[PDB]
Amino acid sequence: MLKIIIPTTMLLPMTWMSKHNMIWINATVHSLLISLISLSLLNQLGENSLNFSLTFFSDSLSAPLLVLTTWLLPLMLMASQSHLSKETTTRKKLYITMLILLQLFLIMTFTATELILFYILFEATLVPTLIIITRWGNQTERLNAGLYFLFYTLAGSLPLLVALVYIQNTTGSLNFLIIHYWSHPLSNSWSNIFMWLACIMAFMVKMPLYGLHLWLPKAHVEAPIAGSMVLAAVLLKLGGYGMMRITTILNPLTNYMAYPFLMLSMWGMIMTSSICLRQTDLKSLIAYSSVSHMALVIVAIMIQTPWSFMGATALMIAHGLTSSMLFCLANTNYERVHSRTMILARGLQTLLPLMATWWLVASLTNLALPPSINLIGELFIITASFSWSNITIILMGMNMMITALYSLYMLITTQRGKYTHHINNIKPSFTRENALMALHILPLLLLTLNPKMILGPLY
Amino acid sequence: MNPFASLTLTTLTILTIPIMMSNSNIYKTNLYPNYVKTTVSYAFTLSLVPLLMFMHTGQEMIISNWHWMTLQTVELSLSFKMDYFSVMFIPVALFVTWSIMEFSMWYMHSDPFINRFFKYLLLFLITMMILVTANNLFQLFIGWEGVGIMSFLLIGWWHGRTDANTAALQAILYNRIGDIGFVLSMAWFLTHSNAWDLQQIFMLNNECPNMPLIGLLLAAAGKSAQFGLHPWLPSAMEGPTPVSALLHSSTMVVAGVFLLIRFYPLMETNKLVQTMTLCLGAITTLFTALCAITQNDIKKIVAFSTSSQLGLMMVTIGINQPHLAFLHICMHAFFKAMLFMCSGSIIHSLNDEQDIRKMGGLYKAMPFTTTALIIGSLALTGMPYLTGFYSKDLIIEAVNMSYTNAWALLMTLIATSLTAAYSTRIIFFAFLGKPRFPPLVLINENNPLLINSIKRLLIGSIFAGFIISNNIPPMTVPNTTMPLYMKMTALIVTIMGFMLALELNNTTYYLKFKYPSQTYKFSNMLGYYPSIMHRLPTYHNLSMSQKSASSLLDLIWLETILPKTTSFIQMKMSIMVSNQKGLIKLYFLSFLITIMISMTLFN
Amino acid sequence: SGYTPDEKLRLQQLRELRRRWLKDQELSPREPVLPPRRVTYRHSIFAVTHVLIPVWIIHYYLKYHVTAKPYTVVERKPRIFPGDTILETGEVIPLMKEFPDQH
Amino acid sequence: SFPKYKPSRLATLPATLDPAEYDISPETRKAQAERLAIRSRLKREYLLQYNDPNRLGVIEDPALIRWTYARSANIYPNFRPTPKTSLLGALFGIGPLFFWYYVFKTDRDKKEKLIQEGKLDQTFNISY
Amino acid sequence: SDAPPLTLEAIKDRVLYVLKLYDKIDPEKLSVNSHFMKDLGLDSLDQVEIIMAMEDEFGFEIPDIDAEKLMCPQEIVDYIADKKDVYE
Amino acid sequence: HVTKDMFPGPYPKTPEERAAAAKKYNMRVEDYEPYPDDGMGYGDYPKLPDRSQQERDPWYDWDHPDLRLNWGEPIHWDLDMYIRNRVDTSPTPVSWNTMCKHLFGFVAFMLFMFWVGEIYPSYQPVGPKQYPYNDLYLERGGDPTKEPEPVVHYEI
Amino acid sequence: AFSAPAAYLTHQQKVLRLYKRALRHLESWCVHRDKYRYFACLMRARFDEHKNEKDMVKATQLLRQAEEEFWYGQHPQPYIFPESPGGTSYERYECYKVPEWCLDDWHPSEKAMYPDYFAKREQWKRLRRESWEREVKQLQEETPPGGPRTEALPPARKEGDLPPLWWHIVTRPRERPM
Ligand SMILES: CCCCCCCC/C=C\CCCCCCCC(=O)O[C@H](COC(=O)CCCCCCC/C=C/CCCCCCCC)COP(=O)(O)OCCN
Numbered sequence A: 001m002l003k004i005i006i007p008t009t010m011l012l013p014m015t016w017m018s019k020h021n022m023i024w025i026n027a028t029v030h031s032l033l034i035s036l037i038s039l040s041l042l043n044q045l046g047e048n049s050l051n052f053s054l055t056f057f058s059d060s061l062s063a064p065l066l067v068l069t070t071w072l073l074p075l076m077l078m079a080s081q082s083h084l085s086k087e088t089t090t091r092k093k094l095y096i097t098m099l100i101l102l103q104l105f106l107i108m109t110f111t112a113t114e115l116i117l118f119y120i121l122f123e124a125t126l127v128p129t130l131i132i133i134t135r136w137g138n139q140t141e142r143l144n145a146g147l148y149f150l151f152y153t154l155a156g157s158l159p160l161l162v163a164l165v166y167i168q169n170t171t172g173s174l175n176f177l178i179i180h181y182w183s184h185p186l187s188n189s190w191s192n193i194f195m196w197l198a199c200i201m202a203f204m205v206k207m208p209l210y211g212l213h214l215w216l217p218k219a220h221v222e223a224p225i226a227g228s229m230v231l232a233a234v235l236l237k238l239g240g241y242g243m244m245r246i247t248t249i250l251n252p253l254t255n256y257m258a259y260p261f262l263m264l265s266m267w268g269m270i271m272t273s274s275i276c277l278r279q280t281d282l283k284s285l286i287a288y289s290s291v292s293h294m295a296l297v298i299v300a301i302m303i304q305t306p307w308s309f310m311g312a313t314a315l316m317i318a319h320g321l322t323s324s325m326l327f328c329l330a331n332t333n334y335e336r337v338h339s340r341t342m343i344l345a346r347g348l349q350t351l352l353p354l355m356a357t358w359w360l361v362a363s364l365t366n367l368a369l370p371p372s373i374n375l376i377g378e379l380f381i382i383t384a385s386f387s388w389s390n391i392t393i394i395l396m397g398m399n400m401m402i403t404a405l406y407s408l409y410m411l412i413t414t415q416r417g418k419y420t421h422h423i424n425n426i427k428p429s430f431t432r433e434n435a436l437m438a439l440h441i442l443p444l445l446l447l448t449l450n451p452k453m454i455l456g457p458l459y
Numbered sequence B: 001m002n003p004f005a006s007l008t009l010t011t012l013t014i015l016t017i018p019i020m021m022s023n024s025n026i027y028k029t030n031l032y033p034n035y036v037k038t039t040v041s042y043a044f045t046l047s048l049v050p051l052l053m054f055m056h057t058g059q060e061m062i063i064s065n066w067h068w069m070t071l072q073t074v075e076l077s078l079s080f081k082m083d084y085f086s087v088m089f090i091p092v093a094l095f096v097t098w099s100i101m102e103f104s105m106w107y108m109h110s111d112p113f114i115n116r117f118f119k120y121l122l123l124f125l126i127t128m129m130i131l132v133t134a135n136n137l138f139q140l141f142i143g144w145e146g147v148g149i150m151s152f153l154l155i156g157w158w159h160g161r162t163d164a165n166t167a168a169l170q171a172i173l174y175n176r177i178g179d180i181g182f183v184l185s186m187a188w189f190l191t192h193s194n195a196w197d198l199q200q201i202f203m204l205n206n207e208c209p210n211m212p213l214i215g216l217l218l219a220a221a222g223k224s225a226q227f228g229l230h231p232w233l234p235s236a237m238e239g240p241t242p243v244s245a246l247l248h249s250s251t252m253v254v255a256g257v258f259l260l261i262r263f264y265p266l267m268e269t270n271k272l273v274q275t276m277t278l279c280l281g282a283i284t285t286l287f288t289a290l291c292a293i294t295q296n297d298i299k300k301i302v303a304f305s306t307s308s309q310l311g312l313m314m315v316t317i318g319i320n321q322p323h324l325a326f327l328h329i330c331m332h333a334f335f336k337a338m339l340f341m342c343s344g345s346i347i348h349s350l351n352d353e354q355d356i357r358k359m360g361g362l363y364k365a366m367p368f369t370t371t372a373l374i375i376g377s378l379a380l381t382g383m384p385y386l387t388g389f390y391s392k393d394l395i396i397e398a399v400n401m402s403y404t405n406a407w408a409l410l411m412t413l414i415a416t417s418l419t420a421a422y423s424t425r426i427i428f429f430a431f432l433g434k435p436r437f438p439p440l441v442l443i444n445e446n447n448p449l450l451i452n453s454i455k456r457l458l459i460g461s462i463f464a465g466f467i468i469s470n471n472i473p474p475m476t477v478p479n480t481t482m483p484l485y486m487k488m489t490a491l492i493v494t495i496m497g498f499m500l501a502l503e504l505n506n507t508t509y510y511l512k513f514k515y516p517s518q519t520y521k522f523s524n525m526l527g528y529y530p531s532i533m534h535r536l537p538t539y540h541n542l543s544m545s546q547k548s549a550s551s552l553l554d555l556i557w558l559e560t561i562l563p564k565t566t567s568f569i570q571m572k573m574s575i576m577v578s579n580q581k582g583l584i585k586l587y588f589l590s591f592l593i594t595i596m597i598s599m600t601l602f603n
Numbered sequence C: 001s002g003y004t005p006d007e008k009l010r011l012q013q014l015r016e017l018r019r020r021w022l023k024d025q026e027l028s029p030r031e032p033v034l035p036p037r038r039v040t041y042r043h044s045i046f047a048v049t050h051v052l053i054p055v056w057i058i059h060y061y062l063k064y065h066v067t068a069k070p071y072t073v074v075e076r077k078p079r080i081f082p083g084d085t086i087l088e089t090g091e092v093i094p095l096m097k098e099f100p101d102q103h
Numbered sequence D: 001s002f003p004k005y006k007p008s009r010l011a012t013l014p015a016t017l018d019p020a021e022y023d024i025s026p027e028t029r030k031a032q033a034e035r036l037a038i039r040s041r042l043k044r045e046y047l048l049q050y051n052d053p054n055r056l057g058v059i060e061d062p063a064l065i066r067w068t069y070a071r072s073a074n075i076y077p078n079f080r081p082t083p084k085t086s087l088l089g090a091l092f093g094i095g096p097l098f099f100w101y102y103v104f105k106t107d108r109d110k111k112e113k114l115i116q117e118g119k120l121d122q123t124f125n126i127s128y
Numbered sequence E: 001s002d003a004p005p006l007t008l009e010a011i012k013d014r015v016l017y018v019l020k021l022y023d024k025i026d027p028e029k030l031s032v033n034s035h036f037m038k039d040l041g042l043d044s045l046d047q048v049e050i051i052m053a054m055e056d057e058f059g060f061e062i063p064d065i066d067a068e069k070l071m072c073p074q075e076i077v078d079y080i081a082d083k084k085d086v087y088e
Numbered sequence F: 001h002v003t004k005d006m007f008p009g010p011y012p013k014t015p016e017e018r019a020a021a022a023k024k025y026n027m028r029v030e031d032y033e034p035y036p037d038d039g040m041g042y043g044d045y046p047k048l049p050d051r052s053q054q055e056r057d058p059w060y061d062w063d064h065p066d067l068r069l070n071w072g073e074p075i076h077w078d079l080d081m082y083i084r085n086r087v088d089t090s091p092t093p094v095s096w097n098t099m100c101k102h103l104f105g106f107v108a109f110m111l112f113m114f115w116v117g118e119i120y121p122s123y124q125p126v127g128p129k130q131y132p133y134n135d136l137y138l139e140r141g142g143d144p145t146k147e148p149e150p151v152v153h154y155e156i
Numbered sequence G: 001a002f003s004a005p006a007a008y009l010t011h012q013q014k015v016l017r018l019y020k021r022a023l024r025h026l027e028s029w030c031v032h033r034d035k036y037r038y039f040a041c042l043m044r045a046r047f048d049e050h051k052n053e054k055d056m057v058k059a060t061q062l063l064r065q066a067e068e069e070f071w072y073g074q075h076p077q078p079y080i081f082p083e084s085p086g087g088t089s090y091e092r093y094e095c096y097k098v099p100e101w102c103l104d105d106w107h108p109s110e111k112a113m114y115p116d117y118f119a120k121r122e123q124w125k126r127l128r129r130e131s132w133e134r135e136v137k138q139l140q141e142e143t144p145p146g147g148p149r150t151e152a153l154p155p156a157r158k159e160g161d162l163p164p165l166w167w168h169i170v171t172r173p174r175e176r177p178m
């Protein structure tokens, strides 16, 4: 596992010793090389895991997330290359350093043999993204967004530290292998109920759960493109990964403690989707769609069945890729219009046809069209919920319907109709943006050919 | 070995070559439409062979070639079913598509993006073939979604028009409403039968419960535009004529009836679901015929005719006659496609004019279109020894001789009468009167592409019904003996509708003006179904999406509870704690108080 | 009614300008300067490259790979009628019960 | 005399049938004149900014900015806890949750009782 | 489409042709520059009916605000030419 | 370029600030009408007529022909609800109540008549169909080791 | 469309519009031409009876009952021309309309094709550049104080002067560009 961590750490001296006009080239090249190296982790076993050492290990659940995290950084660099043109070399190096540190923290977070180390790195990731949002942010509300994003997560995660140290003092270890092998049932007690709440709330606040999702539209609107990319693709999956790992010790309490949350998601995935129908901002619309998808993932995790787990993993990967693509598209529009409103730039398919094709493919992926992995995860979770209770389908069906609607809404308002007359600074699309979209979309349709790589360890 | 499998897969394989060549140089020239049309014709003539082999022997095969994945005890693999339905529907669909593309090479000559149009037509054809030949529910769902998304892309062909966009979104909406039931059926089948493969579903379900068949019926109603979800099919006329002629008249729409046919062994074991199917078909056909009676746009009239035919096919499904419904699918393909082609030829000849009020005497000005439309209307109305005879007459016979609803029987009889009536309306108002178009006459059919495309389907609508009926093996117990009055009831209601419609249209020459009756108004606005059902629910959703969803809950109360209360409490406590004047008097007084409290309290 | 004089002059001048602009919209014979640079017969080549090659590949794939595994390609049992003969075994189906034939 | 047309929220009264347009006073003419005057001033300023060859950007529309700000960020500072808002929020945010909870709890309890009683016929139910 | 590119001469010829079919106005008195109310003594309803006939002849309908101030044949031809973008 | 003072503010209470808000929104003081002063944060923004965007004049030379809006004019709070691709409030030839009554009556009568036809069905003067080998017991389900009760069919 | 609107609608204009709309809907009702002509002359006969009415009160009371009666008998599916705001091809070609300014972004390789057109385009650009500078001054000196009272534009009055605000009216894409 060190063969991935060490080059990521070496990315920092490379960036700081690079020429004043070559930082982007070397950063992108070596990030892509690190992604190629990390591709080896996909080789998994039907047995326990690949236990590299006493400190790190990999699984069929950590492997897709690690590969996605390593693949993200070149895309973030290409996205951030444009709007940082008038920046001093030292500050560009600081920005690249923040991105590299965030990737390193996520890489060592997703392996994490021991729960306290996982918590340490999972809380360490809060700093680079907070600095990115509050420093390289366009609007004056970036400070409030940073405060919200920091304090929601810290309030959720502070009881988790107490719960984890209490676990280590009682059972004796926090190593995940020993935790799984020496697992014992949880008695129905008030102490155990608060134990469950402390262990669960920290991850459920970052998914985000409906009603605890107020921070996400703010942190998405006020962040730069790289911040929105990283927080929509991987940083949302930290909560899902945490719940998937930690639920092994919460049984059989979860059978009846999950009821308040399931409802909050089952209704919430509807409500936010309806919110997407009436939105004047592209970024807010995509943020609310992300909230809906992550609510469905929460339902899948709380159901706690094999099909639920595989569907949740596939949905996490697919949602990350699609959300990053959509935010790239929105940022490309913003860099031309500088407005970030839906109704100003209209009829863009007349002006940018290939970008219209990219919009169509992104919307179709978000619409969960077969045989894309989005639909694979969605269908697996829907079937598992149907087995959980035959009535759930109703809500599920409604959400699916509404989903398609708003997706096509986002496709029709921005690309069809009559172009706005007074916007004439719509330059033809660069090769950089088109390459970014192609590198976003081709992995999705390639993963569609081999779903077993993203179906988790329960495949 | 066994050329059946090789040829059946080769047709689908070669149907996809121009899609791969879409990035090659031929896509940037004007020869691409001819290339795609030639590919389609070759595919049809190649597919003609497995049908012949089945006709000789009765060959059926399943081909599970590629193994996609395995999920514990479930196995998902790329499997094609090539039974009678597939090997019969493929040649008909390919023939209809070939005629439609040859027609479109003339109709869409002035469109700058004609290669994209042909590319889209071919993509829709591929997705339809995938849907038809599918052996498991996942592949069938893939085709189900592909045809729908291709219809969305083709309806909104002119994206600069608001009405095209809203019509495409409406079609997507209704098809997703059907998709809810489709997904419910898929979940039920995999939960209970533990497989999506058709063979296991057939084995493990001897007495199919209500829920999976309810889901299948909902999906079929959504995609076939039944009474509950009808308006999308007539509103889908915003697209080009070639698209409407093939996608919405004879191929994509029959997807729901085909799905119900695929699961006919399970449908016959449920008596309630068959009753619901019959009732839904009857209401669909009568409502659509009533609407088509008074419509004035030719395309809308033929769309309502197609909806009525689909309702009649669902009625056939209800009385447990699936093979008859498939035969009616095959015949309706031919004559409905020809009717749409003739209509589009008239519109192109009259400078993009669709209303029948501004088109008069074309009977002599454009004879080939007139005779083709006359033959198509005769076949549609059940003229004996024609293509529509062998299906529709047997439908009427079987519905009249079965233990079914009396209301449904009356409903289909009235629907047949109204079908004759609106066919007469089309002919009378489009070919018989005096001309009513602008003085500048641009009428011309002298184009070999259009003539050949029309005449191929015209020969089809004359002979294919007889050929297919005489070639397929028997599939149902025939009705040999009939009471004489019940035997001719189809012809009787046909001529009754003809005579009554002709008498009613003859009175328009009278110099009498009377305001329209209440019943007539109801028929013109489509029972007011499009109005209220497109104004009341949508509004009552969207307003909530702004009021309860975003402002009240997300922007007001969820912000009030956690963040704002905490901030207010902390600010107030900070103000109380820090607000000291800096006097050591009060400081040491508090020191003394806390000293005495500690002394007297913790010991 | 009618136009005010200012309206007539403005409409006239705008219309002359529009006609001039529209006349400028035409193309000279040499206008598309294309720069050139390079590096039954049609029906026969079509039938070869668009039918024969795909069917060859499909036949090979089905004959030697798909059929290599069990139950991938499975066939409906051919119908057996009385009086028939079987190539594999050679026995003959005995006839039926000589039903009473009339009309 | 003919049957009256009753307008509704979703089907408004035609402009030709409004009695208000027939009640003509010099005040109404003055109001219409100043309405068209402000419309003409806005159109003049928009066209002046639009036809200028020097501009190569997006004409900032204060109305659009005001609409977006009012839709997004002007809700809470103008929000006051009232019995109407409190009651509507409580209903729309708590009622559906408890209603779905009751529905699903009843369904799952019935299913569990049937499972314990053994009368469910869970044959072939392998994947869950 | 296959629509021939009609010209100003064609449009003027059509307008004068339809005007000559109007019996209320004399064929000899009418000119390309002849006014309706004053040079021909017509009514406002006559003008609106003439606009109706032009709309029916040419297949497109003129909006009422534009048609009410269309008082002479030459400006009718000019309006139609501007609307249909015909060169010469 | 937008200053702090032209952004929407709180509900106007005195006529002076009412006229100031009307001037800010580019509309007449007499035409200006804010939303009621309830908890919902409509605030300063004007209560425009609930008329849809479809029924606006199609011949006016709007700056935005597709949306039929003019630059600088006040925007309806629910503009995204009426964009001609969504719910519209254009007048209809028949009144709303009459259309609702007619459709509801038609559907209710249809359902009632279908139920009645279910109660009173239609059939033919024939007896039940006869199948040879004990209503085809062996080929329908099977169970060959049970010897079911034989059923013989009546020849007439 | 081309004509600037007025602050209000006169009674004469309103009655003309009622006549136009009623005649069109009657034509829609009576499909055949001869029947249409018969009922149209009848309609004109019942229309001009109150032509010579004098007082405003009765005239305003009229044209109101007429509007209500028309509303009751309005033929809920009238005939609409294909390019009309309700026709079958209202906005068919709006997707082929492309602004002129996009030609400023063409690659020089593409600009190599069609050289005469682009030379004329630069000529038009220079003409617009001078005429705009003239037009700003002409419009500010011409406008009444306190803001314009109507959206009507004055024409050009000098020799080399061009009509104010002419660029985006003259350079419309086309009616049917492709
Ligand atoms: C978005 C903000 C969310 C913030 C987190 C919300 C969840 C809060 C979790 C509860 C807080 C305390 C957790 C304690 C850590 C777990 C350790 C544990 O469970 O051990 C228990 C100890 O359990 C406790 O002591 C817990 C007491 C709670 C004290 C603090 C109360 C905080 C507020 C509680 C209500 C809110 C919780 C849910 C909030 C939902 C989010 C809004 C047993 O200890 P013993 O005494 O040795 O065993 C007895 C037998 N000899």
Ligand SMILES: CCCCCCCCCCCC(=O)SCCNC(=O)CCNC(=O)[C@H](O)C(C)(C)COP(=O)(O)O
Residues within 6 Å of the ligand: E043, E044, E045, E046, G011, G012, G015, G016, G022, G023, G025, G026, G046, G047, G048, G050, G051, G052, G053, G054, G058, G059, G060, G062, G063, G066, G067, G069, G070, G073, G074
């Ligand atoms: C099926 C549809 C049914 C609709 C029927 C509607 C009912 C029709 C009957 C309406 C009766 C009336 O006119 S209501 C009568 C209202 N009062 C007047 O008309 C008095 C003055 N008339 C004018 O001024 C006119 O414009 C005029 C002088 C005619 C023209 O003038 P020009 O041209 O010189 O400009």
